[PDB]
Amino acid sequence: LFHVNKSGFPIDSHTWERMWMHVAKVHPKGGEMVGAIRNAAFLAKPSIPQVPNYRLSMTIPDWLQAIQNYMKTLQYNHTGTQFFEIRKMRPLSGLMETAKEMTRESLPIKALEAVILGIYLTNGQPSIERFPISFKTYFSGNYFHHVVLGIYCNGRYGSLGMSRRAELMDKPLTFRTLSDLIFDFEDSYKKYLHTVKKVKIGLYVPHEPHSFQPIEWKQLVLNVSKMLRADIRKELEKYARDMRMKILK
Amino acid sequence: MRECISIHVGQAGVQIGNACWELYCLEHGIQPDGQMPDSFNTFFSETGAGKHVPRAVFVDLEPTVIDEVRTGTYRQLFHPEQLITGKEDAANNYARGHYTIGKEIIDLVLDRIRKLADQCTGLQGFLVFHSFGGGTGSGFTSLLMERLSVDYGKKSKLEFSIYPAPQVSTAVVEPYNSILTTHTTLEHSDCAFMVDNEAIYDICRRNLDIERPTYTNLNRLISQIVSSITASLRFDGALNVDLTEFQTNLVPYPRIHFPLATYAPVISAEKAYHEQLSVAEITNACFEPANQMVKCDPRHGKYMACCLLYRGDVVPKDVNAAIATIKTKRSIQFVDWCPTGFKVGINYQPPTVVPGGDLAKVQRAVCMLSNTTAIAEAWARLDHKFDLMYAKRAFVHWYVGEGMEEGEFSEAREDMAALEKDYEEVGV
Amino acid sequence: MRECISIHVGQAGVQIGNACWELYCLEHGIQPDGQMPDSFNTFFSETGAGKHVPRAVFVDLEPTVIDEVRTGTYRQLFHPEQLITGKEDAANNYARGHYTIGKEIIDLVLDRIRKLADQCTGLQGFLVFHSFGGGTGSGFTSLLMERLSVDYGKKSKLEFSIYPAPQVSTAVVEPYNSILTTHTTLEHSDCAFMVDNEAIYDICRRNLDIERPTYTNLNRLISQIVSSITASLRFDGALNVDLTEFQTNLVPYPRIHFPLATYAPVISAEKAYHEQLSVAEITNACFEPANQMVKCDPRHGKYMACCLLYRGDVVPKDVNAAIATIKTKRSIQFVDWCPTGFKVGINYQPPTVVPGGDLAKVQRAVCMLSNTTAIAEAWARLDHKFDLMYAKRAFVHWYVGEGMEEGEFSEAREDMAALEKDYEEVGVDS
Amino acid sequence: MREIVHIQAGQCGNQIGAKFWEVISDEHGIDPTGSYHGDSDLQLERINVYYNEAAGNKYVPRAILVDLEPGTMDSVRSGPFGQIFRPDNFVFGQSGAGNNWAKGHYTEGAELVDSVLDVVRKESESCDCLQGFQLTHSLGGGTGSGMGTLLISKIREEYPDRIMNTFSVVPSPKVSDTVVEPYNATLSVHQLVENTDETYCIDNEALYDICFRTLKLTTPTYGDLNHLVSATMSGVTTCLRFPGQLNADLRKLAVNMVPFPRLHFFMPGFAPLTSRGSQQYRALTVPELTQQMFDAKNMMAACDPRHGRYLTVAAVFRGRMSMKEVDEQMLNVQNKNSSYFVEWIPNNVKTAVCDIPPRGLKMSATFIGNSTAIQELFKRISEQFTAMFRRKAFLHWYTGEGMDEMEFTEAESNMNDLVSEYQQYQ
Ligand SMILES: Nc1nc2c(ncn2[C@@H]2O[C@H](COP(=O)(O)CP(=O)(O)OP(=O)(O)O)[C@@H](O)[C@H]2O)c(=O)[nH]1
Ligand SMILES: Nc1nc2c(ncn2[C@@H]2O[C@H](COP(=O)(O)OP(=O)(O)OP(=O)(O)O)[C@@H](O)[C@H]2O)c(=O)[nH]1
Ligand SMILES: Nc1nc2c(ncn2[C@@H]2O[C@H](COP(=O)(O)OP(=O)(O)OP(=O)(O)O)[C@@H](O)[C@H]2O)c(=O)[nH]1
Ligand SMILES: [Mg+2]
Ligand SMILES: [Mg+2]
Ligand SMILES: [Mg+2]
């Protein structure tokens, strides 16, 4: 499994050599390009993507699109080594500090820190409202998990996130219902012959950055595979109504 | 060990709770100030120096009725914090109670329910009192019932609602509120007990011969029924029926849990002299259509399951003879798949009489609960009322503007269509 | 043969000490004039003819509060030399209290400490009372604690501070004082018990039903907690816990010793009749978030170690039962590396109620101390305050004018960041 | 002859010892003032086992009391039967050890240890035939654990040819009143194994279970638990003071219970324990006692004997009974429960009958079972140790007294060694 940087910055010797051993092992050709990049005297300096700023004139779907293209520009991590250690139960303010230092450094990003970045970017807009979604799925005799960030601006459901695949990480605000969104995710997942087993939905995140409220991820959980989609849709629409009225607590 | 905590919501709930707690205080001997001059353990808690505090939580979004209780004759009984108030009522609006004004107060009451439940060694269940017509007693009870179901998933909740009457009404948007409350009272309850004001008015006009009754008489009768239900936990008798034994023998299918109560003998203090009041007579009186506390016709429906909770000077042989006589009647039509449908319980404690009430000092009484199918009609009329208003979308702008959406009306109506279909399905 | 000496610095410290010594004189039966009409030995010295002298040192750079005590009803209690006074206040300035105006008085107090600690045989520690916001309670406490730490290396010092509240405040330069005092409170003291005014205002408004409480009520509550802490030294019970015992029980690592206190049952005389107030009830009342005397929610943290000092009519079986029901609850989250996290202590003397105050004459009471990780919020907010002002260099010229150096402002901030990081990195799983 | 020296360390040990002395003095018929007002000459025949004669014909206990805080001396001397002790045998310190093993063994206890050896030496050289010593203490603490360990090490180094009997109250997981119990417990029992001949692991949870279940007490204070422990204590060594048909001193129990040198940690019991209400619904006969002793709900250590065979068992009966009854009963007890006994020991029961019963009873019996289930009582502690020492929590308080980190690893390694050795015979 992919390992996590924990020495702050810069990267310590142990994690450095561990990552290089990992990439040497997995890469079939292996040592040639690895050693070439190690002993490369000069390499092209990557540019710094500029953090976009909210503007009132331009519309909110284009805002979500803009954050999505910036995230795409940030070169999604497939090196197999996390660079910013995240804790689920940690209070929100620590995650805001993590998000702002991550934007300062602008390194490769995975799904969890991608949705944290999305929360950090969208925290400035009371009209926009966002929450997490998680899937636990089954394929090839092993279980895998994925996480994305849903949005409910202007009475419409949309999705942001990251993945090595293309269509599993970005949807627009064009969904009347949350059920249509999650079933679209299920169909895209089936397109790769991966079976979703369980689906989990949390809560709207508070709009105050400097707070200690933790992020909820398990407030709703279903076993999607066993049950027929009608009951799933009914329970999900009940839950969406319970959420947008702020009743759940 | 055998304890229940009662919750009173809205004006109707609080005003019935007044009569209920007066009745319990008279039953167990407690003075209005709490000082007695071990059956009390079900409802009361001793707090040293011989002071008994009720296990009650009075709630309302308006400090006008709870203020009357606070300054009334029972000011020294309830714990001062148990009485919980707001600032502005729900205003006959479901959405004001369930969404806007209710969310600022629910935590303060759930904390006290938790604090009360911690004091119980063994908790039996809840007793929620409310009314369907109101906005507090619909939205707030929906919110509270959802939260209690999430928190205490095992305990059984028994509602005692005041269903709107066919003719007499004191509000223009009762159908909307009732249809919205039905979802919570069907999903989260265990035994909803429906009541009408017209039926009890007629009962006092015929039997008690009170030509100009008011809400005090109605609340006293309802309180007498509630005291009859929970008699087996407090006192002792030949055949005892607690809440879970009570729920079984009455609920054949998980959704069919809407019985309707009855009581007998209700008579004036002067008419008792000429009347024998034997067991057979009160048993027959319980089954007549003129003593039902819902304006409904039991003759057009079959009794699925029945339960006769006796109390006072009774012995099982007369009860058996009475039930045998009842079962051979042709008007009393039972359902085929229930060859026996009579649960019996007996207590040695006869009924009590409040000093200011117009009821006779009887020697034996019976509370008759029935899961009959006639109550569908009592719902059907109300659905008709809904159909007249929702066609024009009348009064809907208040509900949508308060926060609620519009599809909730349609889905509540379809759920009532489903419920009536289910009630018609059985008894075929 | 078991003692501790009390130092009260600044207006807040002196005013809390007033209530504290009122309470102590009440508990042991000492008259206001110090004449009784051997459990008093912890706080009082007998000097022939029954005269009782508190082991206190009242200090303030400004003479008005000390003069108020000199003219008050306890003029005959303290002997006059203990009440030391300056000439002009520190004026909410750390640099005046520490460097400029503190130098002229510090020797005159240190020797007095050297006198008092030379009268006792066995000494357990010090009870320092101060406030973070002030210029006296910060700078003068810094100087005094530095001098004592270099003097008595191995004597525990217990600060009882008053941390600034999040929203309620009564000064414009509080963050600059608190951040500067964070260096002395760490690394010199042994157990600092933070307290807020907003939390106690809420407690008095809700529990005691007082719409207009003033500082006297807050001082009475804090006095009750301190008298509960220093109770196993004066009386006897089933379990006894002196200073070093609960210091070893609480402080896991050397650099995190900031517990937050609690008390129960706080109830008015009217609501007492409708309440039972058993051991289980009061034990559960300590853990609800509406009773913490620091404006922070303990539900967003974990408890490292806890200490439940019971007193009154209690027996250990009830305490074990209550601790069991607490351990069953999933809301109250403890840390995995502390499988046992309760230090129990029972005492036989019940609480004492001052006549002029408003608290029920209850029969048992518990003081709960918790080394929880939720305290960092109470720090984090204040750092933000500092960050908003120091960015503009606002008010810095006042501090640098009194000889203070500017780099210390950034050094204190990075020290506080290090403290928060260390406090957060523990409590992680495994 | 065969005289016994008794020592007490810590609050728990001091209180249990005070109750033990009250029980013993009542048994022998001794005035609270120390004078003798007995009735039977059997009481006075073997008074010298625990008492010293003193001029004016009064009896002083052969006891020594130690603590690092002087409050417990005041409480013990003020309490009942506090004046019998000799004042010069009291040894106090300046302040307690908080709860710190390294404080009560290396820094603050090493200065007071010389006085306790000196008084013990005086008491032991003022007698002719010394059998052994008896200490009371608790493992979960700083004083009773560290000071007790230091004391037994020194005394054993000075008397290689005697026996010891430490009645240590082990720490249990459910009832817990201290945050650093596992460290102290492991550090002490590292040294109890090699420097002791018998150890009777009492526990508070099992005692509370006995009070609630059998005795049916509403409010069990520490007085009741100390009374039960004192009853066991008086039961164990009764054969040294009274005649019996088949008697057994401490060394006979030592050579019967212990097959291998390291296995000397016992679990006691006692019968008949009966509630006040249920006095009249029992026969008070040998079958009742024998059934009550082997009841799993009667052991004073919070362990389930069903998860371990008994290596060896003892039962010191007390009263006027027949001997064929005892033999047949403790034979069929073994045959009925053969699955709960060891196959490679032909006989697992050593009996002993003494004529004189307790004061308020017609007959009684004391169970002393060497069960292999006792590993559980240690296993839990080891787990707690590994929970804390993994993160070095609370550890700097012990390193501050000059105690290195490798001691903790050594003690834990030995702890696992002992648990493995006990588990080996299942
Ligand atoms: N049967 C009894 N058990 C007790 C008694 N006192 C304590 N115990 C238990 O002892 C356990 C800890 O023992 P101690 O407090 O005596 C440790 P000690 O005093 O010897 O060292 P210091 O704390 O340094 O004084 C405590 O958790 C109690 O559960 C008692 O009087 N009787
Ligand atoms: N039987 C009986 N019915 C009552 C009593 N008080 C009110 N009601 C009924 O309650 C119905 C309306 O509900 P309310 O209780 O007034 O409304 P609410 O629950 O207080 O909610 P709000 O309107 O927001 O105050 C009316 O149709 C009344 O018939 C009473 O004391 N006895
Ligand atoms: N609880 C409590 N807090 C007080 C009291 N008096 C002042 N404070 C707090 O003290 C803070 C201000 O610092 P002070 O203690 O007054 O400063 P000082 O000690 O007088 O030092 P100088 O400013 O030089 O006079 C305020 O934020 C108050 O919250 C009091 O009587 N009780
Ligand atoms: Mg109203
Ligand atoms: Mg001042
Ligand atoms: Mg001690």
D122 and D233, same domain (yes or no):
yes
Dihedral angle of Cα C45, C51, C55, C60, to the nearest 10 degrees: -160
C271/B45 touch (CB, cutoff 8 Å), yes or no: no
Whether B60 and B89 map to the same domain: the answer is yes
C-alpha closest to that of D157 among D107, D194, D105: D194
CA–CA distances in Å: residue B107 to residues B111, B144, B210, C34: 6, 10, 44, 50
C310 plus C265 within the same structural domain: yes
Q: Could you tell me the sign of the dihedral formed by the alpha carbons of D59, D64, D70, D75, in that order?
A: negative
One domain for residues D85 and D103: yes
Q: Are residues B95 and B137 in the same domain?
A: yes
* Integer Cα distance of B416 and C48 in angstroms: 89
For residue C88, give how far its alpha carbon lies from the nearest alpha carbon of chain B (Å). Answer: 49
Q: Is B387 exposed, middle or buried (0-12, 13-18, 19+ CB in 10 A)?
A: exposed
B161 phi-psi bin (left φ>0, alpha ψ -120 to 50, beta other): beta
What residues have CB less than 8 Å from B2, skipping those under 6 apart?
B41, B42, B122, B124, B233, B242
Contact between C231 and C349 (Cβ < 8 Å): yes
Give the Å distance between the CA of B382 and the centre of ligand 4: 22
Please spell the DSSP secondary structure of A87-138, one letter per residue.
-SSS-HHHHHHHHHHHHHH-----HHHHHHHHHHHHTT-SS--EEEEEEEEE
Which H or E run includes A181?
A: helix A178-191
All residues of chain C having their beta carbon less than 8 Å from the beta carbon of residue A91 are 300, 377
Other CB atoms within a 10 A radius of the CB of residue D154 amount to: 16
* B49's tokens: 């120096």
Are D24 and D234 in contact by the 8 Å Cβ rule? The answer is yes
Cβ–Cβ under 8 Å, residues D319 and D288: no
Pair B167, B59 in one domain: yes
Number of domains in chain B: 2
This PDB structure is determined at a resolution in Å of 3.6
**Rounded Cα–Cα distance for residues C26 and C19 (Å):** 10
Dihedral, B56, B62, B66, B71 alpha carbons, nearest 10: 150
Q: B276 and B170 in one domain?
A: no
Strands D310-319 and D363-371: antiparallel
Ramachandran angles phi, psi of C340, nearest 5°: -115, 125
CA pair distance D52, D134, nearest whole angstrom: 16
Distance (Å, whole) CA C372 – CA C333: 10
Q: How far apart are CA D123 and CA B206, in angstroms?
A: 100
Beta carbons of D405 and D399 less than 8 angstroms apart: yes
Atom 7 in ligand 1: residue holding the nearest Cα: D12
β-pair type (C52-54, C44-46): antiparallel
Chain C residues lying within 8 Å of D94, measured CB to CB: 1, 122
Provide Rg for chain D, Cα atoms. Answer: 21
State the CATH number of the domain containing residue C273: 3.30.1330.20
Q: Are B11 and B90 in contact (CB under 8 A)?
A: no
The catalytically annotated residue of C198, C245, C408, C420 is C245
Task: Kindly state the DSSP code that residue C264 receives in the 8-state scheme.
Answer: E
Top mutation candidate among B8, B11, B60, B98 for ligand 2, by most atoms within 8 Å of CB: B11
Report d(CA A100, CA A103) in Å as an integer: 5
Distance (Å, whole) CA A168 – CA C180: 51
Q: Are residues B175 and B297 in the same domain?
A: no
- Contacting chains of B (3 CB pairs or more, <8 Å) are A, C
**Pairing state of beta strands B156-160 and B191-193?**
parallel
Residues in B touching C275 (Cβ below 8 Å): 47, 79
Residues 6+ apart with CB under 8 A from D384: C339, C340, D173, D181, D182
Residue type, A118: G
Which bin fits B230, alpha (ψ -120 to 50), beta or left (φ > 0)?
alpha
User: Is C135 close to ligand 3, i.e. is its CB under 6 Å away?
Assistant: yes
Radius of gyration of chain C (CA): 21
Rounded Cα distance, D336 and C407, in Å: 83
Chains contacting A (3 or more CB pairs within 8 Å): B, C
Q: Which of C176, C174, C140 is nearest to C159 (CA)?
A: C140
Beta bridge partners of B309: B345, B367
CATH number at residue B20: 3.40.50.1440
Print the domain residue range for D383.
Answer: 376-424
CATH of the domain at D86: 3.40.50.1440
End residue of a domain, out of C250, C269, C302: C250
C-alpha A210/C-alpha A93 separation (Å) is: 5
Residues 6+ apart with CB under 8 A from B251: B190, B191, B257, B305, B371
Residues D104 and D174 in one domain: yes
User: Do residues C213 and C351 share a domain?
Assistant: no
Q: Phi and psi at residue D367, in whole multiples of 5°?
A: -95, 130
Interface of D with C in 206-235 (CB under 8 A): 208, 219-222
CB D198 within 8 A of CB D158: no
Question: Quick one: C265 and C164 in the same domain?
Answer: no
Sign of the Cα pseudo-torsion (B413, B416, B420, B425, in order):
positive
Which DSSP helix (H) or strand (E) runs through B68?
Answer: helix B65-70
C-alpha–C-alpha distance, residues A108 and A119, integer Å: 17
B185 plus B277 within the same structural domain:
no
CA dihedral B269, B273, B274, B278 (to 10 degrees): 100
Give residue B300's domain range.
Answer: 263-376
Query: Which residues contact residue D358 at a Cβ distance below 8 angstroms, ignoring those fewer than 6 apart?
Result: D27, D231, D234, D318, D364
**Could you tell me which of B120, B127, B86 has the C-alpha nearest to residue B104?**
B86
Strand, helix or coil at B58? strand
Q: How far apart are CA D407 and CA D394, in angstroms?
A: 15
Which residues of B participate in the annotated binding site? 10-12, 15, 62, 90, 131, 134-137, 170, 174, 197, 215, 219, 243
CA-based radius of gyration for chain B: 21
Q: C72 Cβ partners below 8 Å, 6+ apart?
A: C18
Structure-token pair, residue A238 = 């009940």
Measured between beta carbons, the chain D residues lying within 8 angstroms of C308 are none
The residues near D345 (Cβ < 8 Å, ≥ 6 apart) are: D259, D311, D312
- B88 belongs to the catalytic site: no
**Strand order through the sheet with B303-312:** B263-264, B364-372, B303-312, B342-345
Amino acid at D128: D
Q: How many CB atoms lie within 10 A of CB B55?
A: 21
Tell me the two tokens of residue A77.
Answer: 């991590």
Structure tokens at D27: 């048994």
Angle at B231 between CA B228 and CA B233, to 5 degrees: 150
Method underlying the structure: cryo-EM
CA dist C186 to B286, C159, D205, D222, Å?
A: 79, 10, 40, 40
Tokens of D251: 């060394």
The H or E element spanning position B125 is strand B123-129
Residues of B in contact with C274 (CB under 8 A): 47, 51, 53, 79-80
Angstrom CA distances, D91 to B178, C64, D66, D141, D154, stand at 81, 51, 5, 19, 17
Name the 3-class secondary structure at A214.
coil
For A218, the token pair is: 């398990």
Q: Are the C-beta atoms of residues C405 and C411 closer than 8 Å to each other?
A: no
Q: Please choose, from the candidates B294, B308, B263, B223, the residue with its C-alpha nearest in 3D space to the C-alpha of residue B22.
A: B223
**Residue closest to C180 by CA, chosen among C418, C412, C416:** C412
Same domain assignment for residues B215 and B281? no
C401 in any annotated domain: no
Asked if residue B413 lies in contact with residue B383, where contact means CB atoms within 8 angstroms, the answer is yes
Find the chain C residues whose C-beta atoms sit closer than 8 A to any C-beta of D.
1-2, 122, 124, 236, 238-240, 242, 244-245, 247-254, 305, 315-317, 320, 324, 336-344, 426, 430
How far apart CA D340 and CA B166 sit, in angstroms, is 76
Longest dimension (CA), chain B: 62
- Whole-number Å distance, alpha carbon B385 to ligand 4 midpoint, is 23
Please tell me the distance from the alpha carbon of residue A14 to that of residue A201, in angstroms, as a whole number: 37
Domain final residue, candidates D232, D257, D282: D257
Q: Is the CB of D149 under 6 A from ligand 1?
A: no
* Other C-beta atoms lying within 10 Å of the C-beta of residue C236: 14
Judge whether D79 is annotated as a binding position: no
Sequence spans of domains, chain A: 1-249
How close, in Å, is residue B164 to chain C by CA atoms?
38
**A171-186 core/surface letters (b: 16 or more CB in 10 A; e: else):** bebebeebbebbbbbb
D252 and D141 in a common domain: yes
Identify whether residues D226 and D250 lie together within a single domain.
Answer: yes
* Residue D137 near residue D145, CB atoms below 8 Å: yes
- Cβ atoms of B345 and B236 within 8 Å: the answer is no
- Is the Cβ–Cβ distance between B89 and B62 less than 8 Å? yes
**Pseudo-torsion of CA C237, C241, C243, C249, nearest 10°?**
-170
Is C112 a domain residue?
A: yes
CA–CA separation, C239 and C249 (whole Å): 14
Distance, in Å, from the CA atom of D418 to the CA atom of B428, rounded to the nearest integer, reads 75
Distance of residue C280 Cα from the nearest chain B Cα, in angstroms: 9
| D276 and D252 belong to one structural domain | no
Does residue B333 sit in the same domain as residue B197?
no
Burial of residue C280 (CB within 10 Å: 0-12, 13-18, 19+) is middle
- The owner of tokens 């200065």 is D111
Q: State both tokens at C261.
A: 């206190």
* Residue spans of beta strands (DSSP E) within C234-294: 260-264
Q: Contact B172/B133 with Cβ under 8 angstroms?
A: no
Residues facing residue D125 across a β-bridge: none
Contacts of B242 (CB under 8 A, 6+ apart): B2, B124, B232, B233
Mode of pairing for the β-strands spanning D265-268 and D363-371: antiparallel
Cα end-to-end distance, chain B, whole Å: 43
Boundary of a domain, candidates C220, C250, C280 = C250
Per residue, the 3-state secondary structure of chain D, as one string, reads CCEEEEEEEHHHHHHHHHHHHHHHHHHHCECCCCCECCCCHHHHHCHHHCEEEECCCEEEECEEEECCCCHHHHHHHHCCCCCCCCHHHEECCCCCCCCCCCHHHHHCHHHHHHHHHHHHHHHHHCCCCEEEEEEEEECCCCHHHHHHHHHHHHHHHHCCCCECCEEEECCCCCCCCCCCHHHHHHHHHHHHCCCCCCEECECHHHHHHHHHHHHCCCCCCHHHHHHHHHHHHHHHCHHHCCCCCECCCHHHHHHHHCCCCCCCEEEECCECCCCCCCCCCCCCCHHHHHHHHCCHHHCCCCCCHHHCCEEEEEEEEEECCCHHHHHHHHHHHHHHCHHHECCCCCCCEEEEEECCCCCCCCEEEEEEEEEHHHHHHHHHHHHHHHHHHCCCCCCHHHHCCCCCCHHHHHHHHHHHHHHHHHHCCC
- For C384-411, b/e burial (b = at least 16 CB within 10 A) is ebbeebbeeeeebebbeebebeeebbee
Domain limit, last residue, from B201, B216, B247? B247
Q: Which of B99, B162, B226 to mutate to test the pocket of ligand 2 (most atoms within 8 A of CB)?
A: B162
Show which residues on chain A lie within 8 Å of chain C, measured between beta carbons.
87, 91, 93-94, 210, 212-214
The partner residues of D370 in beta bridges, in order of sequence, read D312
B195 bridge partner residues? none
Calpha distance D156→D152 (Å, rounded): 6
CA distances from C215 to C12, C13, C26, C206, C359 (A): 9, 12, 20, 16, 15
Is D95 within 8 Å of C339 when comparing Cβ atoms? no
Residues B69 and B111 in one domain: yes
Helix (H) or strand (E) holding B179: helix B174-187
In a domain, C63, yes or no: yes
Is residue D244 located within the same domain as residue D176? yes
**C52 to chain B, closest Cα gap in Å:** 40
- Nearest-angstrom CA–CA distance, C398 and C404: 9
Size of interface B-C (CB pairs under 8 A): 23
